[PDB]
Amino acid sequence: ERVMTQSPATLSVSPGERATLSCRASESVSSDLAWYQQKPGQAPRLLIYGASTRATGIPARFSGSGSGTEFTLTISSLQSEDSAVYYCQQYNNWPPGYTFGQGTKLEIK
Amino acid sequence: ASVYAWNRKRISNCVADYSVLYNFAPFFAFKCYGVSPTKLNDLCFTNVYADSFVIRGNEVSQIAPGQTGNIADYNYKLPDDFTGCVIAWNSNKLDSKVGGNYNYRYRLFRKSNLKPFERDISTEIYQAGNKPCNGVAGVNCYFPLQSYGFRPTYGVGHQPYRVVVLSFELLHAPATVCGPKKSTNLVKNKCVNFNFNGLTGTGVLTESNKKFLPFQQFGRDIADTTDAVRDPQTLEILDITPCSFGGV
Amino acid sequence: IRGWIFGTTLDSKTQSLLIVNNATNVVIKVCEFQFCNDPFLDFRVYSSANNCTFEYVSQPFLKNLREFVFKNIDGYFKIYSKHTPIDLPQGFSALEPLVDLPIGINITRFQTLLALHRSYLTPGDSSSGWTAGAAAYYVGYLQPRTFLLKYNENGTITDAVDCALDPLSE
Amino acid sequence: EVQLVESGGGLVQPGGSLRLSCAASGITVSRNYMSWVRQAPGKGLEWVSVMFAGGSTFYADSVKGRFTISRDNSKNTLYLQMNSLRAEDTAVYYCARDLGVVGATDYWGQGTLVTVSS
């Protein structure tokens, strides 16, 4: 049962630039991961699973990186609709298992 | 080899020592149900089944009678009334490479649970809808053989444990495997209890003068009194006389 | 003559038995090998796949009168044999225990295996066959009987009396 | 289209029972690793339960012994019976189809609110 800690808590970046979010594990998580974007008002949507594999459809504007116990997600150019909450979910124990994050609130200006 | 299509061997017709089994040094976990280890070391059977494979450390708890999990529900399933024991070694050095000792691909998609000791080696495409990914992509393209990715940075839960399971069958057993030693040096000319390969008795043993034919093992006089015996070690013939007794 | 075959059937549906002598060694095997319409005449083998559970090898069992007694009662298949210099002679001679095997196959029928030099081998052949030396083999059936055996001073049987042959013997 | 629609969400008195249902579409359930997840209002998510393709089910520790997952294969649906609903279990519950290492959770359920009388 590896506890994940997200950082930073909040982030407000000017339009058109990049955004960087870190998620830190306590045991090894090297390639057991996923990133979810839960736009406020409905269920989350998977963007990038494993280490950096982009889920189908998911705009290339997203990029995942990291390995071991530390990972980071980066967005190239935030559009107005990118505002949502994001969670890094691990599944290092798959049958039966998952461990979620604290979520991150992303806004614009 | 792999947990996918594990490896087997059917031991028979030998003297099962066990002096090294579960007594050699680098063994990590050994435990049997139904049989105690020492009795085991003295038990004897019709056949033995050894089944070696390699699993991830965090899944060793699933090798148990009727135990449920992934590796024990869709990959390899041992019976509920399984008598015999399993052994697991933390092969955290022997089978691992920073590049990934994942040559073996375990089973993560099966249509229905296994019957005990059912080799279910197959190369198929688990799917949801009509076609497999040969004509579809993304949806319904699942492949049960997943790599391991064994590399040394991995923690214990993901270090390849090598496991070997022993299964003793006992039906109609003209048992061809029993290997307990227990042979003590012989004493002569004194009232001694002797047990020659099953012949049990008491008496004084003396050097023989009788010509045993090479296929004979015992000698008896009139009225079934076992009078002589040939040693199973040095093949020397010995005479038996009950030591003195009488009324006072 | 180089061997025998025992078993409940020639098909692979059951674990038949094989005993094959040779100039080098004996091969005893139990593998349910399905046989052809006729036993092959050794071109070293003619049978379907096998799934043997027991196999064994040792030195070979060899005017010379060769005798063998095949018995299968207690879950063991036992062989006795004797080879003597010299039709069956009137001379007396007892057989010695040769091998006592632990295999527990249910044997009910048996056949022989023949051989010949530079002979063709096929799964099915007519009654033409191939040439071989002049030879013959006799068969007798055992029955439960009571025998009075006479042992001499060296532990060898020299005479025997059939307890149920005639009134004087009885 | 491929989808998961949920039902059973509502209100029940503490200690009571309830039963949640999950329907799927354009995808089978019998052969899909099914998993019910839940979310407390304003908080993250937590894996609640999973049912396999062989029948061996699993539950989170917080709900072990009280909730039971089952599935109506005939019409490609999943179910979760709950009982002894306490003050914590007020949350929105989601139905999901998880593949795992070959693609993490993607397809999610509309959710179902589960609150208590008080």
Author numbering:
A (entry chain J): 1 to 109
B (entry chain C): 348 to 595
C (entry chain A): 101 to 142, 157 to 176, 187 to 210, 215 to 298
D (entry chain K): 1 to 118
What do the authors report?
The BA.4/5 S-trimers adopt various conformations when bound with antibodies: TH003- or TH236-Fab-bound S-trimer complexes adopt the “1-up and 2-down RBDs” conformation, while only two TH003 Fabs can be built due to structural hindrance from the neighboring RBD. TH027 and TH272 Fab-bound S-trimer complexes adopt the “2-up and 1-down” conformation, and TH132 and TH281 Fab-bound S-trimer complexes adopt the “3-up” RBD conformation. Group 2 antibodies, including TH132 and TH281, which target the RBM face and can be categorized in the RBD-2a community, directly block the binding of ACE2 with a similar binding mode to IGHV3–66/53 germline-derived F6129, CAB-1730, B3831, CB617, BD-51532 and ab133. Group 2 antibodies TH132 and TH281 shared the same germline origin of IGHV3–66/53 and highly identical binding epitopes. For clarity, the TH132-spike complex was used for analysis of the interaction interface. TH132 interacts with the BA.4/5 RBD with a BSA of 800 Å2 and binds tightly to BA.4/5 S through extensive hydrophobic interactions. G416, N417, L455, F456, and Y501 of the RBD formed strong hydrophobic interactions with F52, F58, L99, and V102 of the heavy chain and P95 of the light chain. In addition, hydrogen bonds are formed by T28, R31, Y33, A53, G54, and R97 of the heavy chain and S30 and N92 of the light chain. In contrast, TH132 and TH281 show a broad spectrum of neutralizing activity against all Omicron sublineages. Unlike most antibodies escaped by the Omicron variant, TH132 and TH281 tightly bind with and neutralize all VOCs tested. Meanwhile, TH132 and TH281 target the RBM face of the RBD and can bind with the RBD only in the up conformation but recognize and tightly bind with residues that are crucial for RBD folding and ACE2 binding.
Elite nAbs, mainly derived from the IGHV2–5 and IGHV3-66/53 germlines, showed potent neutralizing activity across Wuhan-Hu-1, Delta, Omicron sublineages BA.1 and BA.2 at picomolar NT50 values. In this study, we used single-cell sequencing technology to isolate hundreds of monoclonal antibodies from convalescent patients of BA.1 breakthrough infection and identified dozens of elite antibodies with NT50 values at the picomolar level. To further analyze the molecular basis for these elite nAbs, we determined the structure of Fab in complex with Omicron BA.4/5 S-trimers by cryo-EM combined with X-ray crystallography. Next, we evaluated the epitopes of these elite antibodies and found that these antibodies mainly fall into two distinct groups, which was consistent with the results of the epitope competition assay.
